[PDB]
């Protein structure tokens, strides 16, 4: 009768009190999705079914997901990650001669497929062009020419706004050619809703966390600026 009616309303209040407390933690954390081209060395970056990590920087909580338990070529589960802050894409830039179409073509095709997705139409991508020293050594040495596998490398010139830093004139051209090859796909498809952030990464460096922090800050700032019709 009325004895049980008040009993249920007591348990509802306890549950609703817990949900309010847990809502604060959910809204104050940022989720990231980590991808890869298959042999890009994305586990070394993390070290330096599904695997998740927790870390915070400047008292801001972050949460990363790695999907190695699903080896399917098609990605039916990619629609679940439509509310993440950003996607981290790791590619080995020193694999232009490995047939494994070479690996760079497969990575570019995967990037194009991910960028032109119905569900992922408002998510930015943080791009890590890994294995820089292998690429530098292979370019400096002979017996391997990029124009053999990518004919457009011939007649291509280094852009004026380049920051080679005490480098060979050659190595510098190859890096910017690959970065522009990715940016060409990045720019055309989308217009203002999501951008791409390319970086040159190796195994020795340890500044990647700061880079992720900075691109996340820029992503949120641009989101708010576009929402307020100021951009």
């Amino acid at each position: 009768q009325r004895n049980e009616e008040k009993a249920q309303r007591e348990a509802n209040k306890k549950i609703e009190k817990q949900l309010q407390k847990d809502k604060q933690v959910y809204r104050a954390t940022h989720r990231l999705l980590l991808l890869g081209a298959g042999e890009s060395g994305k586990s070394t970056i993390v070290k330096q079914g599904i695997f998740e990590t927790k870390f915070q920087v400047d008292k801001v909580n972050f949460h990363m997901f790695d999907v190695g338990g699903q080896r399917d070529e098609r990605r039916k589960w990619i629609q679940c990650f439509n509310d993440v802050t950003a996607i981290i894409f790791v590619v080995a830039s020193s694999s232009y001669n490995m047939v494994i179409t070479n690996r760079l073509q497969e990575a570019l095709n995967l990037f194009k497929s991910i960028w032109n997705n119905r569900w992922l139409r408002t998510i930015s991508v943080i791009l890590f062009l890994n294995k820089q020293d292998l690429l530098a050594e292979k370019v400096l040495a002979g017996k391997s020419k990029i124009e053999d596998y990518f004919p457009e490398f011939a007649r291509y010139t280094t852009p004026e706004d380049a920051t080679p830093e005490p480098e060979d004139p050659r190595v510098t051209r190859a890096k910017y050619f690959i970065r522009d090859e990715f940016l060409r796909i990045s720019t055309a498809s989308g217009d203002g809703r999501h951008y791409c952030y390319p970086h040159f990464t190796c195994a020795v460096d340890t500044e990647n966390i700061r880079r992720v922090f900075n691109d996340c800050r820029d992503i949120i700032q641009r989101m708010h600026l576009r929402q307020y019709e100021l951009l």
Partner: protein
């Protein structure tokens, strides 16, 4: 050789079906009066989920239900008084399915962790974890208090034993991800629609495929038995629904419209089997007529994609969930 031998049988299968097409379902049911106009209004709205919803299962009592969300919660409701009864936190935040035991003693769960977990409601704590699949779980249904059937993204289904956690039998034959399944009323056969645009009729006791249907043109997302048990319906992401008959072993009717281009996420039948309710990507649900393929109602109370849909055992209410973290009871 062997490849050519299989081609000869495919022609024999197709020829046998063509001889049994005496007439069509549309022709026979031309003289029955139409159902008319059906209008439903929201009776309850349930709030408390912090993120989108993928799964929902009604209780056998037609009063309690369970739901799942990406925030990592499994909330059991009371549809009558709108009161939360339980809230189980999950280890993994990526949940894709849920189920409710026929006896009301256990609740199952699963997702991207490739594991099915069973919780003891009347003891709440984890009672069993089932592992062995190599792909994300897509669906799970309780055969009884000690058995459960699961399907995953490794193109295989399996039957489990909760007491010992061992796969009693395994079902193989699909070439794509299995997306859904549904048990027969008597719990002796079940059907599964996969990503290869094909559905198969399995036998639980024997463990073998019996019949195969290959009507759709794209990914199959939903499946449901007719109340009689001699037919079922499917829904693909080409905005079409089809009704298949087991005894005739061929498709009978198609449900489509020229103004719909969005995919279909879930289907369900009515208590008498006359109405067919299907959820779409355009944020609203449509109500069809099983015997005439004519629309008879629209449910347009949601602000995001509808992901789940269910009808009670007594046929008194319809519950829908969507990506805006709200459930609604329609009557």
């Amino acid at each position: 050789q062997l490849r050519q031998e299989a081609e000869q049988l495919k022609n024999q299968i197709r020829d046998a079906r063509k001889a049994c097409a005496d007439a069509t379902l549309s022709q026979i049911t031309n003289n029955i009066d139409p159902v008319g106009r059906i209008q439903m209004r929201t009776r309850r709205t349930l709030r408390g989920h912090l993120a989108k919803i993928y799964a929902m299962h009604w209780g056998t009592d037609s009063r309690l239900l369970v739901s799942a969300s990406q925030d990592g919660k499994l909330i059991i409701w009371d549809s009558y008084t709108t009161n939360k009864v339980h809230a189980i936190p999950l280890r993994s935040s990526w949940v894709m399915t849920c189920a409710y035991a026929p006896s009301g003693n256990y609740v199952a769960c699963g997702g991207l962790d490739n594991i099915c977990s069973i919780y003891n409601l009347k003891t709440v704590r984890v009672s069993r974890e089932l592992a062995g699949h190599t792909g994300y779980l897509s669906c799970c249904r309780f055969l009884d208090d000690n058995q459960i059937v699961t399907s995953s993204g490794d193109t295989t289904c399996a039957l489990w034993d909760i007491e010992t956690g061992q796969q009693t039998t395994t079902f193989t034959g699909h070439t794509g991800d299995v997306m859904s399944l549904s048990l027969a009323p008597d719990t002796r056969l079940f059907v599964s629609g996969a990503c290869d645009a094909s559905a198969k009729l399995w036998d639980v006791r024997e463990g073998m495929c019996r019949q195969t249907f290959t009507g759709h043109e794209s990914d199959i997302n939903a499946i449901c038995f007719f109340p009689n048990g001699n037919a079922f319906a499917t829904g693909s992401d080409d905005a079409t629904c089809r009704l298949f008959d087991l005894r005739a072993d061929q498709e009978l009717m198609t449900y489509s419209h020229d103004n719909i281009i969005c995919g279909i996420t879930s289907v369900s039948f009515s208590k008498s089997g006359r109405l067919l309710l299907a959820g779409y990507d355009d944020f609203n649900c449509n109500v069809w007529d099983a015997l005439k393929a004519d629309r008879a109602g629209v449910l347009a109370g949601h602000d995001n994609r509808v992901s789940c849909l269910g009808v009670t055992d007594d046929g008194m209410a319809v519950a829908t969930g969507s990506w805006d973290s709200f459930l609604k009871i329609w009557n």
